[PDB]
Amino acid sequence: GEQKSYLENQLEAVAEKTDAGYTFTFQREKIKLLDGLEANVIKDINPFFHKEIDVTDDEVIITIQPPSSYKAFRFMKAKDKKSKWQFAYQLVQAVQQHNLSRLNLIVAPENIVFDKGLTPYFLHYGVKESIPPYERDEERVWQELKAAAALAVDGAFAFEDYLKFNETLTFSAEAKAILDAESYDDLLELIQTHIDELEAKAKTYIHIPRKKWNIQRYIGLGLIVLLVPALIYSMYALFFAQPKHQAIVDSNRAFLNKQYSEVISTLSKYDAESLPESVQYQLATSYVEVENLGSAKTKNIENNLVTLQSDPQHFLYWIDYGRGEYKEAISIGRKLEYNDYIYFALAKYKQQLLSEDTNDEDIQKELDSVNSELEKAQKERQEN
Amino acid sequence: EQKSYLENQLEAVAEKTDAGYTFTFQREKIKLANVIKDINPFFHKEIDVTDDEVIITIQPPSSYKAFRFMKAKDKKSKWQFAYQLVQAVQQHNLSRLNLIVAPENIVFDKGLTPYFLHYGVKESIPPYERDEERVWQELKAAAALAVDGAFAFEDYLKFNETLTFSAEAKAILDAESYDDLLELIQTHIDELEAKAKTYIHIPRKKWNIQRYIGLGLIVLLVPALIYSMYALFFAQPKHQAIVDSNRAFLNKQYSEVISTLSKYDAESLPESVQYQLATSYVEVENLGSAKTKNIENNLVTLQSDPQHFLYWIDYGRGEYKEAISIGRKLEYNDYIYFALAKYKQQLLSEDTNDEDIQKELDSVNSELE
């Protein structure tokens, strides 16, 4: 199924690409050479293109060899949109600027080659009443031009789709604009606005080598993963660690001045286990002092139970008792096996539970646990 | 009043009015120009012959821009324009029309194709005759001006070994033929396309926003890192030292208080910590039981002048000249005499050539008697 191209069907010629150049072979019957020149006029358009004409008793072979750097139309499809619209602007201009009277155009893709400057060139030209296209056909050339421009810019369909079946196929917005042009200046203005819009868009863009762009991105992301711990630590050091140091300085100053109530208020927002053992000692002796027990009872606690060399559990007991945390202090008293710590905290816990209503079944169960231990220790301490 | 290159070569005044590009010559230098209308028929061309002037007016289509508008385009467009400029000169075949490849004579369309405004006429309008060598040098200078743009047209055209040209400008100006020059431009176009493949394209607004975000992160990270370094390596070890010396003070371990706060200056420590450090220096001094009792409950107390703490820390650290000044400030004669005596002992056991020590020893002995 050797299906022929548009150029081949229109001229009734075989178009091929050999090492010698582009071949356009016609039948002698369809070529009228009435002068002596043998279609010598075709060499007057692109003198830089090597042009040969072979006339035999039954065939006419035209050979066009453009410079090696010139590429066939098919190589436009892979270029960028800016280049496509520049090629289409220059393709319309080359058709519009054609003035050679004896030479007739055929705007087909198989007939176009372009240079490094994206300028299009036609390989085969018809000769007036000699080589097809025999006569000028402005309407045929106009429709060929809009289909070639649409094929080069859109590229969604083949040249014959844009050219012949135009009122049947759902074309692109860019291709419909090209194919619906009513004049050369209208199409040139349509193409110019697309070039102008692309050039304007490109001006608002920066072009960075991917390696440089990527290293700047990892630098920026590295700054973020370094700023989140530095900010979080700074917040802790400024709003938690620094005011704790000043509180430890202030509570240690108030302790030396026997201002036991001031030590309590200065360290009131801190948990006993967060404070150092020496600070725990000072807070516990301050709670013991503020408790206002007997002179002899206080003397027993301060030099036998809550000393700088005693179990830090003794400090935790008096801080819990001093902060109204009796259920917590009772557990500490049970751990140290000190029955006086258990009984003295159980008595205060009973009053704390008694302040709560007698309609909370959890409070009544806890109050029944306390009352049983207080009546057990009273009969034991009074006998032995 | 030096004119432009085009003006000096043709002996004409070149201007741009609303009617088009003006090229006015003197009647005497114009020899009897309808051939001028055969190159760009799309350009409106008029010739006015006055009794002493010939004014040529070329009006290309509105969309065509002057040579000066290439400078703001991208390098790829500048190379493509140069390619088509070399081709326009190479393809010029009209025998009676002569070229002048000057920037003030070139315009270009949306497809970057260059066009010449004024053409000379054979033995009629300058350039009167063809000059292939002048045209070749004009072309390479115009191509170099359009592509490089670092210097003016006359600098590239000068063709002298005086100006240190760019590598691209030198390549264009050193071309030996039209094909050598076209191929030279082609490899530069091909090398630009290959370089473009390794590039990412970010909208300038997006790239600028993240640059200020990134710079804002740096101005926020330097104070956060510096504060974190201070809090971790200076503020935290000082808090632990204050905790440790306050624990040792409560345990009557006066020598331990001294060694815990030894790396800190007395004025950097809080007043309560200064008190504990001073009473520790007083205790370590090992004075009399009664003498120590007088100091601890009359001079170095939690409610006394912090200068008393500074005196005992200076005395305890061998800073006798500093302690003497503090004793003089508090007007306490016992603080002056007791520090002057230890300063005399420090000066003793050094050398028998210290006249400054003998003068200081004579000052202390007179006040004690």
Author numbering:
A (entry chain A): 3 to 386
B (entry chain B): 4 to 35, 41 to 377
Task: Kindly provide excerpts from the paper associated with this entry.
Type VIIb secretion systems (T7SSb) were recently proposed to mediate different aspects of Firmicutes physiology, including bacterial pathogenicity and competition. By systematically investigating protein-protein interactions, we reveal that the membrane subunit YukC contacts all T7SSb components, including the WXG100 substrate YukE and the LXG effector YxiD. Taken together, these results provide a comprehensive picture of the network of T7SSb subunit interactions and identify YukC as their interaction hub. Altogether, our results suggest that pseudokinases have three key roles in the T7SSb secretion mechanism: substrate recruitment (LXG and WXG effectors), energy coupling (based on the cytoplasmic interaction with the ATPase, the dissociation-prone PK dimer, and the flexible β-swap region), and signal transduction (through the transmembrane stalk interacting with the putative pore-forming subunit).
We therefore produced a YukC413 construct lacking these residues, which promptly crystallized. The YukC structure can be subdivided into four main regions from the N to the C terminus: the pseudokinase domain (residues 3 to 206), the β-swap domain (residues 207 to 211), the transmembrane (TM) domain (residues 220 to 243), and the extracellular domain (residues 244 to 384). The YukC structure reveals two unexpected features: a β-swap domain and a twisting stalk. Analysis of the dimer’s interfaces on the PDBe PISA web tool shows that YukC dimerization is mainly governed by the intermolecular interactions occurring within the stalk (solvation free energy gain upon formation of the interface [ΔiG] = −22), including the TM domain. The β-swap is located below the membrane plane, where the monomers cross as antiparallel β-strands. The symmetry of the structure is broken at the level of the pseudokinase domains, which are oriented differently in the two monomers. Interestingly, in the YukC structure, the orientation of the monomers diverges below the β-swap. This asymmetry is related to the different orientations of helix α8 in the two PK domains, favoring the H-bond between residues K205 of chain A and A80 of chain B (red asterisk). Taken together, these sequence and structural analyses, as well as in vitro ATP-binding assays, suggest that YukC is unable to bind ATP (and to hydrolyze it).
